Design an enzyme around this catalytic site. Sequence first.
Site, PDB file in Angstrom:
ATOM      1  N   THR I   1      29.216  77.640  61.065  1.00 30.01           N
ATOM      2  CA  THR I   1      29.204  78.679  60.044  1.00 30.01           C
ATOM      3  C   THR I   1      27.929  79.504  60.117  1.00 30.01           C
ATOM      4  O   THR I   1      26.837  78.965  60.265  1.00 30.01           O
ATOM      5  CB  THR I   1      29.360  78.071  58.636  1.00 30.01           C
ATOM      6  OG1 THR I   1      30.669  77.507  58.522  1.00 30.01           O
ATOM      7  CG2 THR I   1      29.182  79.126  57.559  1.00 30.01           C
TER       8      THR I   1
HETATM    9  C1  SA1 Z   1      30.707  76.187  57.922  1.00 31.47           C
HETATM   10  O1  SA1 Z   1      29.821  75.850  57.156  1.00 31.47           O
HETATM   11  C2  SA1 Z   1      31.872  75.279  58.232  1.00 31.47           C
HETATM   12  C3  SA1 Z   1      33.180  75.935  57.778  1.00 31.47           C
HETATM   13  O2  SA1 Z   1      34.182  74.930  57.589  1.00 31.47           O
HETATM   14  C4  SA1 Z   1      33.040  76.742  56.484  1.00 31.47           C
HETATM   15  C5  SA1 Z   1      32.562  75.940  55.299  1.00 31.47           C
HETATM   16  C6  SA1 Z   1      32.221  76.656  54.236  1.00 31.47           C
HETATM   17  C7  SA1 Z   1      32.977  77.945  54.034  1.00 31.47           C
HETATM   18  C8  SA1 Z   1      34.383  77.748  54.591  1.00 31.47           C
HETATM   19  C9  SA1 Z   1      34.353  77.410  56.082  1.00 31.47           C
HETATM   20  N1  SA1 Z   1      31.704  73.976  57.618  1.00 31.47           N
HETATM   21  C10 SA1 Z   1      32.017  72.969  58.422  1.00 31.47           C
HETATM   22  O3  SA1 Z   1      32.152  71.801  58.094  1.00 31.47           O
HETATM   23  C11 SA1 Z   1      32.172  73.450  59.827  1.00 31.47           C
HETATM   24  C12 SA1 Z   1      31.127  72.881  60.759  1.00 31.47           C
HETATM   25  C13 SA1 Z   1      30.000  73.905  60.738  1.00 31.47           C
HETATM   26  O4  SA1 Z   1      30.549  75.134  60.247  1.00 31.47           O
HETATM   27  C14 SA1 Z   1      31.856  74.927  59.716  1.00 31.47           C
HETATM   28  C15 SA1 Z   1      32.843  75.768  60.510  1.00 31.47           C
END
Ligand code: SA1
Lengths: 229, 191, 230, 234, 230, 235, 225, 239, 204
Positions: I1
């Site tokens: 993210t």
């Molecule tokens: C990003 O933080 C992420 C996404 O799932 C994100 C979460 C918060 C907003 C919705 C989508 N969180 C995670 O667990 C994975 C790993 C790192 O980034 C992610 C894609």
Amino acid sequence: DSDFSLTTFSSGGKLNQIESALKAVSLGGQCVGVKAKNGAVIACESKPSSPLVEKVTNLKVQKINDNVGIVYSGVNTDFHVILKSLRKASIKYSLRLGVEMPTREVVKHAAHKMQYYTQIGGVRPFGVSLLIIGWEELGPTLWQVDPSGTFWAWKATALGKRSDGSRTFLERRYSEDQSVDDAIHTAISTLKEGFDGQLTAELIEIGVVDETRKFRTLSTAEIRDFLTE
Amino acid sequence: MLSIVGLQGPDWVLIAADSSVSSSIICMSENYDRIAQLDDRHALAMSGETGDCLQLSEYLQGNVALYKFRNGVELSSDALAHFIRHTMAKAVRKSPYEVNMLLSGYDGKPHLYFMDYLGTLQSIPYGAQGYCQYFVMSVFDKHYKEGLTLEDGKELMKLALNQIKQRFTVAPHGFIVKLVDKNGITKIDLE
Amino acid sequence: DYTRSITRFSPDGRLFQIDHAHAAVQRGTTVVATRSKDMIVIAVEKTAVAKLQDPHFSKICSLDKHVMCAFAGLHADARRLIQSGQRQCQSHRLTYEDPISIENIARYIATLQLKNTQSGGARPYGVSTLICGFDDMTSQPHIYETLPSGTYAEWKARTIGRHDQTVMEYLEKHYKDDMTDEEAQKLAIGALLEVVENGSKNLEVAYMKRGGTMEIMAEEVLDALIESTK
Amino acid sequence: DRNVNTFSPDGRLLQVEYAIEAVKLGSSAVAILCPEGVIFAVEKRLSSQLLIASSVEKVYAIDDHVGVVMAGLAADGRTMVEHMRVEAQNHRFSFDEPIGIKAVTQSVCDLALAFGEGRRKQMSRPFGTALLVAGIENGKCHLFHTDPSGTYTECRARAIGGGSEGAEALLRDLYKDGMTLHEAEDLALSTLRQVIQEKLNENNVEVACARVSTGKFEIYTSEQRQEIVARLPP
Amino acid sequence: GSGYDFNPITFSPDGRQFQVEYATKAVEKDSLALGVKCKDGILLAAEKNLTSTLLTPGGNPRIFWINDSIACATIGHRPDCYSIVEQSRNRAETFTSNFGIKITVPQLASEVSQQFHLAHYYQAYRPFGCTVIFASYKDDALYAIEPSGAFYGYFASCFGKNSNLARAELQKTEWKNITVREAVPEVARIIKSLHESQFKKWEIEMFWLCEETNGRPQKVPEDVFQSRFV
Amino acid sequence: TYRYDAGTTTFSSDGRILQVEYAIQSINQAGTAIGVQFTNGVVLAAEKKNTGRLVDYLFPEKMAKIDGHIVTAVAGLTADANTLVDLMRTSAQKYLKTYDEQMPVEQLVRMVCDEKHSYTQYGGLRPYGVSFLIAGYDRHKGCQLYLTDPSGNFGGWKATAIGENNQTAQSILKSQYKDNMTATEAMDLTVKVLCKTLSLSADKLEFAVLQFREEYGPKVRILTTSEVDTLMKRY
Amino acid sequence: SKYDENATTFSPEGRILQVENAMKAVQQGMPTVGLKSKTHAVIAGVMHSPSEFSSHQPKIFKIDQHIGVAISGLTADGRGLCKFLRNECLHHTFCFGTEIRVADLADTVALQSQKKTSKVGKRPYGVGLLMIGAGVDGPRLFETCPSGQHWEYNAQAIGRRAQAAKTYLETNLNEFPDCTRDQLIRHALRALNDCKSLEAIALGVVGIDEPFTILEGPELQKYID
Amino acid sequence: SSGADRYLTVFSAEGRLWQVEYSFKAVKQAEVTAVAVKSKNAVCVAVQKKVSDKLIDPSTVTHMYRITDNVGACLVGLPSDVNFIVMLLRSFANNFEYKQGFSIPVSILAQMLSERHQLESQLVYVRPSAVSAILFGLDGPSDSFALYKIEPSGYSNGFRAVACGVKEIEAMSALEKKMEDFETPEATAEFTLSTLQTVCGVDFEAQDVEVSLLTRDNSKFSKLPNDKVNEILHAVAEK
Amino acid sequence: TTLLAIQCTDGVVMASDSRTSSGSFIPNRATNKITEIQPKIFAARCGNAADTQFLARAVKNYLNALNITRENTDDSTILVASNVIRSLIVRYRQYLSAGVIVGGWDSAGPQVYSIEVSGMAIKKKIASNGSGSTYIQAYIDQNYREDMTMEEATKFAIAAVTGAIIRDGSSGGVVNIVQINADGAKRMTVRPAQQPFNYDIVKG
Ligand SMILES: *C(=O)[C@]1([C@@H](O)[C@@H]2C=CCCC2)NC(=O)[C@@H]2CCO[C@@]21C
């Protein structure tokens, strides 16, 4: 601390608060119920506060579940609270048992809630009498639930304003062999008898359970169709 | 892992239990009465930690007496067995009583119930809790006859306890056997 | 929860609710508990429709195998007292393994009544209880009278309920310091008969022998003792 | 008014004053403190000879060193003495010492006025019992008086019950600070006999001494009560 | 007159809340306190009619701190006054805990009027016989909550005895046109004109929240305006 | 506070809870309910409170089943009766779950009477203005009939009545009640007593017949409208 | 009279008649006097002796090392308030590690009494407290009222015959700020003497550096002159 | 227990909740009248803003409140009860948005307020909140305007036009005798202010009335600034 | 993210990726990681998706609660949003692995608060969070200027979030831009075709 019961037996064994709630029912707007052979009907003279009121927003005839429907006479807000509780009990019954709460089960739950409020402290009895229609195995059923929580089962009855005259009218002009259309006509005529001035389809709400065993509120068009005849 | 063995007869129940109480590697007592007489009619042999067995026995006996005093009627053997089962079913899920029991009662009919800490209730002609069942069930199967006399019953229970003594590695230093019949629960010696 | 302090003091210093609970007791059936060196006897008069009801509803109850209990007053407040007393006997067994002392259980019943006199939103028990029994820790039969006020007093022979003063006078007159068990039976039976114009068909007599449980007198032995007393 | 915790226009808790009246309706009890000990002499009211006198004991041993005599409602006094016994054993458990006479007196007094009504779930009314708390603390006998109001006062001599006022009047010119325990027993029994409506007897009286020499609150047996009633001038 | 004046939640047949009206009477009995919003800040002045000459000079506050930016003039039942002061402090602390920022007098007044209203809305409570004027320069707010729980922002608020005349006199000045230091003599003159002769010894407990105070509540210094009078 | 409290859990100068006496009076104003024990069962009968040309006698009003072995007739507030019947059913099924045995009739009666008494001693709530004729069977005491009160007092009765003209019905039973009667004899006795005390329309009456048989066990059947009409027409 | 039902009921005049009854209950207590110098504060009072041979009921109490309270009224309520104040001092000496200010204790006790007078089923404390404290706030005297309010005083008298003590304090009010500990104690005892109807008078004296101490009976003989 | 029927919210011998009717009269005690008119294109709510003393900051003397961005509430009643109802309607709206995830509809908010007023009219330890509430807004699911009145009894209805306050009877009579299916938001505003002015029998200025005119364009709640209120008042003084 | 909120002179640019990842699987490839708490207050979400969405809805509830008793609904709302995000994260630090950058416009102007997964809230002119923010930390430091306008900051944020999308497997999809000024909030979506860079920047 108000946990004391305000509904208490009087010197003669008369629950004065129950009689007071029943009087509130008697001044809460006439509602009729008629049990036909192949269904049941509950209508009410829902004359709005003013022509500016939107009827749909405070319909007195309401659904408890797909098969059970309720009309009331008395404090409108008490009916709304009991109606929310009955609908919640029906959806809980569906969650636990997969079917809509039976008609007599809905009636017994309403009666239990009303009795509870007639016994626990800090509260007054619900000032409404409920005409609940729905199908049991042996056929259609109409049920009066009083503020005391005592529930009659009726072939026909009115329990609102001028309900003694309307119950005499039903005693005089009711027959079992009536169909659902005949029952609706009987309910409308009973409302006309106890209503001042010309009755209008706008001013009455009718809810019927028919051979389908599903409760449906008649739209104003259908009520007018019945009135014209 | 204490050896309690029940044997139901036509009109009696021989309920025996390991009479050796223990603390760690020490046999504290050689005559500890592990069989709990909840009622004058029901003897509950209990296998488990001495504390859990004692507390559960006292609770059940108090509840049986309270039922007898609240209502002018004594619990049956099926009613008491299912009350014990309800207690164990409550316990397992929340605050478990780690006791496996054999409820032997005579209420005009002999009854022997296999009960465990979880709450499995089963009327049995004979049974055992602990590892002794692995040693005694077969002997019962080999030697139990319907209509067994009380003397033949004592002989069969003695055979089962002798099998516990001989083949079970942790051999109980002795057993306390109780006859539950129309005369009540009487402690007996099998020789 | 509800706490309306039902029991309050009056200007003269009386708990009027305790007076009313005593009135409820005094409208209850007469009970007469007498003791001997080795046996206690309780005689409760019974008002009933002999042709239309079962006389098996007894005022005498057994709180434990050593605690006998009779009551005068509201049968429901008495049922609650007896239920709590049985629970307390079994809890004392759970906590001590010893049979609850007759003084201990009588104190518990009196403290239940007292708590109802002290707890807000709680109506004093309209029941006076005769907690009788035997203590092995004392080697003495005991007969305590717990009142609605919550006061308990041991008696050599005590009566409660309606006609309690007449039966008390009879007990005081006909009490012997060292009665035998049958003499205690005769005293209790005669004291109850002094106000009752009926025999075994009305009276209910139970007893507890030394190191024994509660035994209800038969309708044959009771009548024989009634005739012997007369 | 009509509620328990109401103040009269005179500034008095009405239930408290009515509990004081209830105490004035209770059996008389005279507590005489002397350097040797504190002596309770209590009227045991026996409605009949069948009443076991030992069971209507108005004297309760709170602990080995401290005791209590009640006046008024025997059941409320039972609650008070139960609290005092629990407090004394808790104090021995928490501080490895006998509870002070003033300390246990103050604890039961704090309990006394904790009555309330009208609040969701406590006692509903004041204790209708006045206690004469007495005991040996640090080689000294202390006599305290608790009344339903919850106030406690240390007393050299005190009276509680029906004859409380008359007993105090008699104690006016009869009580001295240097009396021997013999004289204290004599004075307590004399005052009680004067303020009761029945002839004093070992069976209708309860005598108890918080004795400094023994450091213990003992309750006198029938023999000791006879040994005291015999010496009285009447 | 009628029985509708005992229960706070009871409505008179005219819709009057008699207990709330009596709380307002309690406010009207007390010596007037007022507040004025000025160019440099807000000035709260409370008339303290010292019942005894022994009262500490400058003690017995009527203006209270609620927050490092909010002060609270109080009128009426002083127990209720300080109860509402402490409840306002607790409401500000809870507001900071929930939201991090410091509360504003408008929403602080709303939150405290919630308690004011609950007092006469749910049974088991007494309506607060106090009017609280919350002032904050940093919020440019002067909100007075009445015993009913009605709270209004004011350009110049005043409550207590002779509150109508005090408001009429406050009306004569455009307070925002002037600063706090020149508002102090005017408000002092107002209260002295309305001060009743019967009270010989008294004080003018003035506080201000201004730029000179950096928006913090502060009692008007004695050198600026000696609060004490005879 | 407590200005408008009725002291439901408070004693009167006579020593009787006036709310329990008013509840008893309310019962005495309710439809007569009669119980009669026969050899191996108990017959309960009652007068419906809701009896009109329009009232649809769909289900029993005064009669309720507590378990396969326990049935109850009620005099008094039918709503409190429904509440206590739900409580009794829950208690009987709780006892069945705990002991795998049908609840003894005396213990269910003691449970409903403990509930009714608790309403007369704690909580300042209104008492249950209902008197139950709890017919039932248990192995311990055979077939039993208990009469409960709003006070929480119960008593076994060979035959008894409650409601309006309960004393007249009790006198008629006393004059006519026999021991070891048959089901038909006891049912006819109930019909006679109701007809004398109580109009008299069959649909206005409710009947339930507990019957213990060694083969089937304790069987409770609340007579339907057709059964009640057929039984009454025979007098 | 008809509105003297609860502490929660306002009379048509804005008065809480039950609160006034509790205030009178305070006014029926034994004469209590409080004084305050720039360096010391004093509370004194003629303790009450219910009986001839009963001791005088303690009237002065030590809340904290530099805080004490003299009760006037129901001594049981006074003891309850002393327990509450000692808990507050122990939670201020726990949270902050220093001694609470007697002003804060007055605030807390006033809040508790007001909560007693604002919720039904509670009674106002039938005791008024003359609290003297010393600390960073200096010596401070507070007369806490049953109604739920505390009045700060340089001197004050409460209980019975307290008008004579109040008159004495008013006469010598301007002397108190410069009066030494011994002179403030002498003024206290000579304000109580005007109330005399000593072994009855108990006096707690505190100073900015001097911890609160209770002197009774012969210990006060040196302060009579 | 007799005698509580007039002091507590329990039914009287004649079956009336006297405390509820007295809460209605307490609403009348607000000394202020509200008139709300609903049209297919807008909903206009005008409530007279009577500031008794000009020392009060008029911006705080408000009977119109933002429950949500879309739902406004014109509350006529005891000012303390009005503030309680604004805080209780905002709490209802926030709880509804937290659970259901979307802003509360006017109908559901009216139902919740009616439920609260029923708990007040049943729980004898709760005073009937003396607030006649005019909830209004644009419901998205129907994209149509909702206008509900909840009386202190809890008697809640949907209205084409509603009125509250001292002239509630006269204002409702004038509304029903002159209600129209207006074709413009400004005709709805003109009718609202004209009915309010006529029933109050006094000429209005923007200072003397709070008006919120939620249109299909400006669906979000906001009290109209004095410019628009004066323009509507001049339009109403034209004829 | 990738979260990147820039407090500009004339607004707030909240750039985010649109990739929800369950390990190496992308359950949602067009994720709205910036949640509209209020019309001018947005919460860019990183960490556990469920925890961050609960945080967003709970902060909507908390900010509506802030408005229960006040009429200045657009006053200190961003600071209060950051404070409630921080109090929920610290209160639920055991159960909520959520980091939130709350940015927008209120009475105080444009604001950007970075509340970390630990629950540390810092008012930031330039705030970044998430796994992808690491890859673009140096890029931001080299290309971020305090004086950037909302359009300049929007372009820079698109470029930075695109670089993070390219270099991070957890970050990908479209660049969800939110531009919050006094007038309101404008959402934009920069699809991979419209993104300034591609995977081709890797290895030149
Ligand atoms: C990003 O933080 C992420 C996404 O799932 C994100 C979460 C918060 C907003 C919705 C989508 N969180 C995670 O667990 C994975 C790993 C790192 O980034 C992610 C894609």
